[PDB]
């Protein structure tokens, strides 16, 4: 699934703005789109997704994790190297000016002899090639730094004298962009560095975000072997409103749960690893935590426990995984009794994510029925959202053929109830499907293209809401067609 | 404090938060919990808690330790040096042996550091020196009820002040079977030069030292009088008072 990316997505996802700043100006707004504004993103569950693959170790995602980042480090070089000998202007920024003479003096050293080009010394008298080049000598330990971790156990190249975050990486660049803009030159900034700057806001510093999941029944073993040990009961014999209890005072409380020892198993084991090495690991390169069958609230917390129990600097969020017909029943329940705990409400933000799966939905009950019901489920978890003033995005587990939820990319947006996208959301692209849609050059960006036309237009032009006659007729046959089933 | 901590030490859920604030204080002796670990268990002596006062004050570090991670959690010897902690020693001593858990992992030894320094400071010399043989002498009772191998730690100093003096004049001038088998004793600085400056002095210390001590063992002196007794309690306060 990488290949994609760096061989058709990297270099596209640029192209594709461009194409978005053409139309803009066509209808009149003389202003590219942003920068920053990111209207396509990238994520991955290749090896992140550890649910019934026990074979996608805690070690597995350090692996993964660590590679996309030296994946990512190198592109960029290839990028500034060359960018460098693009932007050899003179005629600089004020600010920019004092930027460049101090890097000059610091660095004072030239020897690098196996620099194919920009070896010796630059002199401040080309203001970015300066800056530019500290960013690709900061971007080499980065790469370096990578390689060694991956190779051996660690690396002689420190933290510092690599990037480590995103914002270490643009203040330079956005510098260089206002410099130009300021000093004249806009257009010369809004070339190949407008086009790198977006890299940075789709890409980010490991290619894409990775997303975690694994059933909750193992969060379960996990907590319950905690308390087993600890002598106080058996989490698992607990009844929801004892479980949201303990669970919610842990939260609250200051003092560690975890005991050193604790009676380790494969899996009990094998869950915590996990946990640490989203801690070892940036705090960027991750996506959500999902949670397949994972029903009451309890276990929506349960993780947000071991996740700052077993250390985590910046938590991921947490996202369910409704799929299982029953379960997109009863889904805006439990999404209504969750965002009722307090504490939770209180650390989410607004902000919250549910994921919704079509492939075993229509598996144990009708296509029809399955189809509708997913209509129904998201269309009221985005009142239950709303209600409680929640920006409830939903994460679509769109198959390859239609019977797991498949289809057009236009038609099957459409098909979504009206006033549940706005500029929001997840879709899944399973395995063969990336091949589809990203195989070929005019293949990807009819893909990016698509999205969001679709997305667009599904939020300032909505589908029809559904007659009452209709929901009445519809809700009827689903149950024949699921009796039929 | 007692409850608690005994509680604390018999339970299997942490304790010291990872956010926990530092001062440039507690941080200092955390710290030097940490150093205990790494270093290899037979490098190191016990932790004394000078100042020592009540049980807790040593179950305290006996759960610090165990709560910064240690191998052979060095053992915990009290410091009894104001008259005060003295006099209430003997009390202090036997609750801790009183407690099954420290009980067992006393493993029937046990010591206890008793100061000549600042206890002479509070109260004049004559009512500590006095003081200190009581407290000698009623700890070890306390020990030989428990059957404990109780040790006594002497923080002798350098002049008379500081409980100064020839060696064997002072072991024996200590309360007749508390020595026995074993005794700690400390060379101030200045000292140290004295009793191994030269190699024949360095000889003759280690001859006075075990030959004292054996004596002590099988040649003890003579137990005070209840007349003597009486009246040294009593010239001790009234030391203490004009002083």
Avoid at 105 to 130: A, D, H, L
Avoid at 280 to 297: C, K, N, Q, R, V
Avoid at 353 to 369: E, F, H, P, T, W
Wanted: glycine share 8%.
């Amino acid at each position: 699934g990488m290949s994609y990316i760096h061989e058709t997505v990297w270099k596209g996802v640029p192209k594709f703005l461009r194409r978005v700043d053409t139309a803009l100006k066509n209808i009149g707004i003389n202003e590219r789109l942003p920068y920053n504004v990111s209207l396509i993103r990238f994520s991955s569950w290749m090896g992140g997704d550890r649910d019934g693959n026990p074979r996608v170790t805690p070690e597995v995602t350090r692996d993964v994790c660590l590679l996309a980042r030296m994946m990512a480090a190198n592109l960029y070089i290839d990028q500034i190297e060359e960018l460098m000998f693009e932007l050899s202007m003179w005629r600089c920024n004020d600010e920019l000016r004092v930027r460049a003479e101090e890097l000059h003096s610091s660095s004072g050293s030239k020897v690098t002899k196996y620099y194919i080009e920009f070896w010796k010394q630059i002199p401040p008298n080309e203001p970015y090639r300066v800056i530019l080049g500290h960013v690709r000598d900061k971007l080499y330990n980065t790469r370096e730094r990578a390689r060694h971790l991956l190779a051996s156990g660690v690396s002689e190249i420190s933290a510092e004298s690599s990037f480590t975050s995103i914002e270490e990486f643009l203040e330079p660049l956005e510098l260089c962009y206002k410099s130009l803009c300021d000093c004249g030159d806009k257009a010369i900034a809004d070339g190949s560095l407008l086009d790198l700057l977006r890299q940075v806001f789709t890409f980010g510093l490991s290619l894409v975000k990775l997303d975690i999941r694994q059933e909750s029944e193992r969060h379960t073993d996990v907590i319950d072997a905690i308390t087993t040990h600890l002598g106080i009961g058996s989490y698992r014999e607990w009844p929801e409103d004892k479980r949201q209890e303990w669970l919610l005072s842990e939260l609250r409380g200051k003092r560690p749960l975890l005991p050193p020892d604790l009676p380790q198993t494969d899996e009990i084991a094998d869950v915590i690893g996990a946990f640490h090495v989203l801690a070892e690991l940036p705090p960027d390169s991750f996506g959500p935590y999902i949670i397949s069958m994972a029903t009451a609230p309890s276990d929506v917390l349960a993780v947000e426990l071991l996740q700052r129990e077993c250390g985590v600097r910046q938590p991921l969020p947490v996202v369910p995984l409704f799929e299982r017909l029953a379960d997109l029943q009863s889904a805006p329940a439990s999404v209504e009794r969750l965002f009722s705990v307090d504490w939770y409400m209180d650390r989410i933000k607004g902000k919250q994510q549910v994921m919704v799966g079509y492939s075993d939905s229509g598996k144990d009950a009708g296509r029809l029925s399955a189809a509708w019901q997913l209509y129904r489920a998201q269309e009221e978890m985005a009142q239950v959202a709303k209600r409680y003033g929640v920006k409830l995005t939903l994460f679509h587990g769109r198959g390859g053929t239609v019977g797991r939820g498949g289809g057009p990319t236009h038609l099957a947006i459409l098909s979504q109830p009206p006033d549940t996208i706005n500029g929001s959301i997840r879709v899944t692209v399973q395995g063969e499907v990336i091949e589809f849609c990203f195989g070929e050059e005019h293949l990807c960006f009819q893909t990016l293209q698509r999205f969001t036309a679709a997305t667009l237009e599904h939020g300032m032009h909505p589908p029809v809401s559904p007659k009452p006659e209709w929901r009445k007729l519809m809700d009827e046959m689903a149950v024949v067609a699921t009796e039929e089933y």
